[PDB]
Amino acid sequence: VCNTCPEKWINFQRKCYYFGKGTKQWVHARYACDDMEGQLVSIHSPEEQDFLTKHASHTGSWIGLRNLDLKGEFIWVDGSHVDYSNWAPGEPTSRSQGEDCVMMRGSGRWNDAFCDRKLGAWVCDRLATCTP
Ligand SMILES: [Ca+2]
């Protein structure tokens, strides 16, 4: 039974989530999550997405999706590929033009963006720990 989360993190299913605040570009958020022993959030189901939207900032948040090698394939920071997606209409933009980072809007839907864009929120996740 794995639902144990650290103080300030919120459990959903087998993961823990931290809804961060404070102005950060994508890689800044990446390291903020890393320094908290987590990583920018990966999303693999509509149930997970719905949970995130419920707790997420109205003004948009960095998540852990990025065009890894700059060549057009978006990969989650945890290493996994996209199965579930929640792209906003028309996203991602059908051009390789250096908008390699993904944010989640107030609606929960995703759009690509310049990685140096400063957003006011960012979400981390980590595995919940378990009772023996
Ligand atoms: Ca776009």
Numbering used by the authors: 159 to 290
From the paper:
In its membrane-bound form, CD23 consists of three CTLD “heads” connected to the membrane via a trimeric α-helical coiled-coil “stalk”.
Unlike MBL and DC-SIGN that bind two and three Ca2+ ions, respectively, Ca2+-soaked human derCD23 crystals reveal that a single Ca2+ ion binds at the principal binding site in all four molecules of the asymmetric unit. The electron density for the Ca2+-coordinating ligands (Glu-249, Thr-251, Asp-270, and three water molecules) and the Ca2+ ion itself is well defined in three of the derCD23 molecules; electron density for the three water molecules and Thr-251 in the fourth molecule is unclear. Surprisingly, in contrast to Wurzburg et al., we found that the highly conserved Asn-269 residue is not directly involved in the binding of Ca2+; the nitrogen atom of the carboxamide group was found to form a hydrogen bond with a water molecule that acts as a Ca2+ ligand. In the Ca2+-bound structure, Pro-250 adopts a cis configuration in all four copies, and the distance between Thr-251 (Oγ1) and Glu-249 (Oϵ1) is 3.7 Å. The structure of Ca2+-bound derCD23 reported here shows a single ion bound at the principal calcium site, liganded by Glu-249, Thr-251, Asp-270, and three water molecules; the KD is 1.5 mm.
